[PDB]
């Protein structure tokens, strides 16, 4: 017996065999999945006259629940069942419509931006539809589908209906970004990019994937704003933060210039607190969403108050708990620690030229520093370098989020002439390293706000390193096109973007790649392959940007790059790197060098290694450069537990080095240093600690500091989270 | 707790076989000389070989000088101090014999009625239930019942909640929320539920149990009529409150009062079922009392037994087992004494039995089925058709031999209506075993000679009965393979029957993916069961996102239960860790 409520109201006999036929289709090709197991699990939940939608999400979920490391292909069974449902939900059948027809409807409904129909003719669409392979929807893992369905696919947020499917998202992302190209190359570039993305070679940030092809022109995910030492600037910064967190951008705030408490007055913290409410202005119940990382030098007079800003037990005025902090450090300071000496704390306002030099010129810093320490007309405060470091190290440890920026490494090993366009801060997750100028007022045309235009190569989807050439052309070009496509809430933002056209392209799936070349993080066994891999990335990237400058002109301010001066990443990297790898450079950096000097680069920076969370779940890939905590990863959702097994777990379980089995941090840090050699910006590098690996379960300060030192020694620009296992 | 022994000195006086033979000899002490030792021999055999289990009072007491063997009673309280007192008095007398109490208390009018309301009286029923216990806290349990729509219901549902004030809480009894179709429909249709004091709405309370159609009329009327004191609540909200207290305490129960009356052996219009016992398997008629000795009250008691489904070689063994079981219980009805006259009347009027099963999971394991997957729906259907048929048959020829029970005429049975005529229809969508026995021959025989007993079957939990036979507890799947108890002799371990050959055949409680399979089996059981079933819902938090069981789920299972005609719902279990 048993009935079924159809899509609108009609009611038919339960078609048991339609269901079964769908599952058999879904299980096609897979291994170690029982169809009847899924059926027994889901059938027992059916009730007379159950909705048709519910038959679907039941069988979907029944499959999802069987996802395990012993049966990884349940993630594919579930995916395909979910895919099939979403087709019917958007199209009322599995067969998707023709591209043109779909796009037309979509403009009628005002969900796609109608310049798509403006910029392309009917068989320009006709053609693109032949580029499409709707079968690639079958390659997604269940977790990936849940991500697509959650936050990529155009859908009504109220009613909950889904309007597109993943392939259209991809083809249409490509069509918009390349909408400007000459007729000769345009559909040729579109086809090629679509392919790179549909087959997971290139990942793109969530705003870009969910937004481009819709009527929006905001796609920004993170900004950097530098705050001057004035109420005008303080206000301006704050205003710019509001505008940006309102678009859900992640904020990076340099705030170290603000003068100390008692200066000829009430000091930093009240203003930080203000930057915080700003960052929180469009969030949740004022607590959840919109994050920021705020930066200051180590030697700032207020530093001991600043470091404990996230500490639980304090007074209210003592604490600004809902932002992360980046302590800025240079060589001199470390030397004070090792030489067991003092660090002097100065209010910026009281020490002319010191702040500036901190970033741009170490030699001068060392001079101005030693002078001012001596000159005792100048307000100062001395602290024991061990003590000061310990404070910083323990707050970092307890909160997991006091970060470190090596400001010398960010400037001696930068694409920017430190003297013209210093890098004096990072973004929220410490991979972005670009020039910034304070603002007079929200609309000051002379500020610079840096933003992050991001992408990534899936190292696990490339068959070999030379694939990165055409991938690097595709990636750099599409991002460069977006730079012109999107809009800028603040003029200072626009200037950085247009001035220096800065890109941050990185990697996902690194651990998987390492696993399958049979290497590990912890033992040094990867140092060379890493060196080879990142020489390949940086070279192909710079090359792609180079011929784009040939084609379209170097970025307006290309002249403030070391690149313009013929200086390359390979000239200025930290030397000790020689002691840990010895792969030869395999490409002609000298041919490239010369070409750069001649035509310039379209982009001032090309590479940054960001963390990914969403990008990498969608491709079933390990997250950027991170090793996986375990083999199966879990998230909550209001659809049950989403499990995702690591790529090729079947053949690679012993090849992975899961995060916590690394004996310590050195191997990893060496790989990060080696990456840094070629990376224009920085890397979201972590330090991890498992307490159960130390006497009486406590991580000793000695260790915390040795790893900090190791990081610096290998020229590591920033240091992001510190993880501490528990139990 | 079975063997006759000196409680002070600690010496033991008998051994198990004598217990068995002597239990049999007393219960059959009245039979004609011709059949008597023949019946005795046969019963002794059924019990010594664990085919039939019996309640602890019966096993420890019968053959000793006592005449009290009662383990649970139902008392219905009228809306008067006389009745309130009477109820209370009857409770004292019964918990003093360590009976488990079922108290219907929904008739008591609400706070503010032309006065101080329910809770102070409940509290009183509680001290009553606790009057012969421990240090006033341990031993003697009760489940108290009210309709969902009772004006006070939001106070009532939170009666077991930890954080309250003292007057706000009556923490040491369980509660049974009474619910019918209309209310659920309000929940699904996302509408309001109206709360009325019973005293302010003539004929509504009555109809709630006896006639849904009339309930729906009187209900919609009174909601409209706005001279009548009312209170409206959001059906979702109200259900959620009930569902979460049920969840947090594990003991707010549900009685589907329509299912207990449309699918009852009693004509709802003459002898409605308007409450249950302590563990929700007993469903029988009750009348309020004027005074402890009011000869016109009805107190229902539970005369219980069980077939060991694991000891029967096949389903037809149940015929002679059903003769033995029904006869022995019927004999006990006359053997034992009654502290309260209203108790005696129910017993003598309707001679109500509750015979159920133990070892069900083991049986299921060894026929290679499981709870969770539907794989048992048919075998279950077959098994319980067999039980109900053989039971009714045994009672039928006892009526031939000794006369139908005095009030047999208030049964649907007297009207030729059978369990198979009135069961919930959707059951057809989940099983399809054909009936294998001649319900029509039986039907006719019943109409002609009647039944000795008004009710025959109820599925109780067992704890002690089933340990003694090494059997899984009634219809429950085992939590694990070895079960532990404390004792002042060390840890007592017991391994599941035939673990060696059956470990993979069992579906241990927590490996059931969810509750549906189980609920379907309970619904299918209900088809033939005269009374009700102590059915559980279980939840393992570690099986849900962020470890919390969603209200959506809690409510879907509540609904599933109703859909399959489930009469009551007992504990909700929540694994921990």
């Amino acid at each position: 017996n048993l009935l079924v409520t159809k899509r609108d109201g009609s009611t038919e006999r339960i078609n048991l065999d339609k269901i079964h036929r769908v599952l058999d289709w879904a299980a096609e090709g897979l291994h170690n999945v029982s169809i009847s197991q899924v059926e027994l699990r889901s059938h027992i939940q059916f009730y007379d006259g159950i909705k048709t939608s519910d038959i679907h999400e039941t069988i979907i979920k029944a499959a999802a629940d069987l996802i395990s490391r012993d049966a990884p292909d349940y993630q594919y069974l579930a995916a395909r069942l979910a895919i099939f449902h979403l087709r019917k939900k958007a199209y009322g059948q599995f067969e998707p419509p023709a591209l043109y027809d779909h796009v037309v409807k979509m403009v009628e409904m005002g969900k796609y931006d109608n310049h798509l129909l403006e910029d392309y003719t009917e068989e320009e669409f006709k053609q693109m539809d032949t580029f499409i392979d709707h079968d690639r929807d079958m390659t997604f893992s269940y977790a990936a589908v849940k991500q697509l369905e959650g936050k990529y696919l155009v859908q009504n947020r109220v009613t909950g209906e889904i309007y597109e499917s993943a392939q259209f998202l991809y083809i249409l992302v490509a069509a918009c970004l390349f909408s400007n190209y000459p007729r000769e190359t345009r559909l040729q570039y579109v086809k090629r990019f679509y392919d790179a993305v549909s087959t997971f070679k290139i990942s793109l940030p969530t705003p870009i994937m969910s937004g481009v092809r819709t009527p929006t022109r905001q796609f920004s995910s993170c900004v950097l704003i530098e705050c001057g030492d004035s109420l005008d600037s303080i206000n301006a910064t704050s205003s710019a933060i509001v505008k940006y967190v309102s678009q859900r951008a992640g904020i990076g705030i340099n705030a170290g210039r603000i003068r100390a408490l008692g200066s000829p007055h009430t000091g930093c913290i009240p203003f930080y607190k203000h930057f915080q409410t700003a960052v929180k202005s469009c969030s949740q119940g004022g607590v959840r969403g919109g994050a920021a990382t705020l930066f200051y030098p180590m030697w700032h007079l207020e530093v001991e108050s600043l470091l404990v800003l996230k500490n639980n037990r304090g007074v209210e005025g003592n604490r600004v708990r809902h932002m992360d902090y980046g302590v800025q450090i240079n060589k001199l300071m470390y030397t004070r620690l090792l030489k067991g000496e003092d660090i002097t704390l100065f209010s910026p306002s009281d020490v002319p030229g010191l702040y500036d030099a901190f970033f741009a010129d170490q030699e001068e810093f060392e001079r101005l520093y030693t002078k001012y320490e001596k000159d005792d007309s100048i307000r100062k405060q001395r602290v024991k370098a061990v003590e000061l470091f310990s404070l910083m190290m323990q707050e970092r440890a307890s909160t997991g989020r006091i970060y470190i920026q090596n400001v010398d490494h960010c400037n001696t090993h930068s694409p920017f002439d430190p003297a013209i366009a210093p890098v004096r801060q990072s973004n929220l997750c410490l991979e972005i390293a670009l020039p910034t100028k304070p603002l007079n007022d929200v609309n000051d045309e002379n500020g610079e706000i840096a933003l992050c235009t991001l992408s990534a190569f899936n190292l696990g989807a490339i068959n070999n390193l030379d694939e990165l050439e055409e991938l690097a052309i595709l990636a750099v070009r599409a991002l460069d096109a977006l730079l012109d496509y999107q809009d800028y809430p603040i003029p200072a933002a626009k200037r950085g973007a247009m001035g220096r056209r800065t890109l941050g392209i990185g990697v996902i799936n690194f651990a998987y790649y390492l696993a399958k070349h049979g290497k590990r993080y912890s033992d040094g066994s990867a140092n060379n392959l890493t060196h080879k891999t990142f020489e390949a990335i940086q070279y192909y990237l710079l090359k792609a940007s180079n011929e784009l400058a040939k084609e379209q002109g170097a970025c307006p301010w290309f002249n403030e790059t070391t690149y313009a001066k013929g200086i390359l990443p390979i000239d200025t990297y930290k030397k000790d790197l020689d002691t840990i790898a010895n792969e030869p450079l395999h490409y002609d950096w000298e041919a490239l060098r010369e070409s750069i000097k001649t035509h310039g680069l379209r982009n001032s920076t090309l590479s940054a290694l960001m963390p990914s969370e969403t990008s990498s779940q969608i491709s079933n890939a390990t997250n950027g450069i991170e090793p996986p905590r375990g083999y199966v990863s879990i998230k909550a959702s209001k659809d049950g537990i989403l499990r995702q097994v690591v790529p090729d777990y079947e053949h690679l379980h012993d090849a992975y080095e899961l995060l916590w089995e690394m004996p310590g941090n050195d191997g990893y840090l060496q790989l990060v240093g080696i990456m840094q050699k070629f990376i224009d910006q920085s890397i979201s590098a972590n330090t991890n600690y498992d307490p159960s690996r130390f006497p009486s379960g406590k991580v000793p300060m000695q260790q915390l500091l040795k790893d900090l030192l190791t990081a610096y020694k290998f020229g590591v620009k920033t240091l992001y989270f510190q993880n501490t296992r528990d139990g | 707790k079975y063997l006759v022994q000196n409680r002070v000195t600690g010496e033991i006086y008998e051994s198990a076989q004598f217990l068995y033979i002597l239990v049999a000899a007393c219960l059959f002490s009245n039979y004609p000389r011709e059949t008597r030792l023949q019946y005795v021999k046969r019963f002794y055999d059924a019990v010594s070989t664990f085919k039939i289990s019996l309640p602890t009072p019966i096993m420890s007491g019968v053959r000793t000088p006592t005449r009290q063997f009662s383990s649970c009673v139902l008392i219905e309280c009228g809306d008067s101090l006389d009745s309130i007192n009477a109820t209370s008095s009857a409770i004292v007398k019964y918990v003093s014999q360590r009976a488990g109490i079922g108290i219907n208390a929904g008739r008591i009018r609400a706070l503010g009625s032309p006065h101080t309301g329910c809770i102070p009286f409940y509290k009183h029923f509680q001290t009553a239930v606790k009057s012969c216990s421990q240090g006033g806290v341990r031993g003697g349990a009760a489940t108290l019942f009210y309709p969902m729509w009772h004006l006070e219901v939001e106070s009532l549902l939170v009666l077991k909640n930890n954080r309250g004030v003292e007057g706000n809480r009556v923490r040491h009894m369980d509660y049974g929320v009474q619910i019918n179709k209309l209310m659920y429909t309000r929940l699904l249709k996302g509408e309001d539920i109206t709360l009325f004091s019973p005293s302010d709405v003539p004929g509504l309370y009555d109809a709630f149990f006896a006639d849904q159609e009339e309930f729906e009329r009187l209900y919609t009327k009174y909601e409209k009529d706005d001279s009548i004191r009312k209170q409206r609540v959001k059906a979702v909200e109200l259900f959620s409150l009930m569902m979460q207290e049920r969840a947090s305490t594990g003991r707010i129960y549900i009685q589907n009062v329509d299912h207990c009356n449309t699918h009852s052996p009693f004509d709802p219009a003459i002898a409605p079922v308007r409450q249950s016992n302590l563990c929700l398997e007993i469903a029988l008629p009750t009348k309020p009392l004027n005074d402890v000795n009011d000869e016109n009250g009805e107190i229902a008691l539970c005369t219980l037994s069980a077939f060991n489904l694991g000891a029967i070689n096949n389903l037809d063994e149940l015929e002679e087992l059903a003769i033995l079981a029904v006869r022995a219980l019927d004999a006990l009805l006359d053997y034992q004494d009654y502290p309260i006259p209203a108790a005696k009347r129910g017993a003598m009027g309707r001679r109500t039995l509750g015979i159920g099963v133990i070892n069900f999971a083991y049986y299921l394991a060894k026929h290679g089925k499981r709870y969770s997957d539907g794989s048992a729906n048919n075998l279950t259907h077959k098994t319980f058709e067999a039980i109900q048929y053989y039971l009714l048959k045994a009672s039928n020829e006892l009526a031939k031999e000794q006369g139908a029970c005095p009030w047999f005429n208030e049964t649907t049975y007297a009207k030729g209506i059978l369990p198979i005529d009135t069961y919930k229809k959707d059951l057809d969508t989940i099983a399809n075993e054909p009936l294998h026995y001649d319900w029509e021959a039986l039907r006719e025989s019943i109409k002609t000679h009647g039944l000795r007993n008004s009710t025959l079957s109820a599925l109780m939990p067992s704890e002690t009965s089933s340990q003694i036979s090494n059997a899984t507890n009634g219809i429950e799947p085992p939590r694990g393979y070895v079960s532990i108890k404390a004792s002042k002799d060390g840890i007592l371990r017991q391994v599941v029957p035939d673990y060696e050959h059956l470990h993979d055949a069992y579906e241990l409680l927590w490996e059931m993916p969810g509750n549906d399979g189980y609920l379907q089996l309970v619904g299918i059981m209900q088809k033939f069961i005269d009374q009700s079933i102590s059915a559980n819902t279980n939840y393992d938090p570690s099986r849900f996102p962020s470890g919390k069981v969603p209200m959506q789920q809690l409510l879907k299972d509540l609904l599933t239960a109703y859909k399959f005609g489930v009469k009551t719902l007992y504990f909700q279990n929540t694994r921990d860790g």
Binding site: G49, I50, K51 | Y184
Partner: peptide, 12 residues
Amino acid sequence: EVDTDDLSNFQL
């Protein structure tokens, strides 16, 4: 927390 929208689909 509850969705009354699918609830309604149920058949009693």
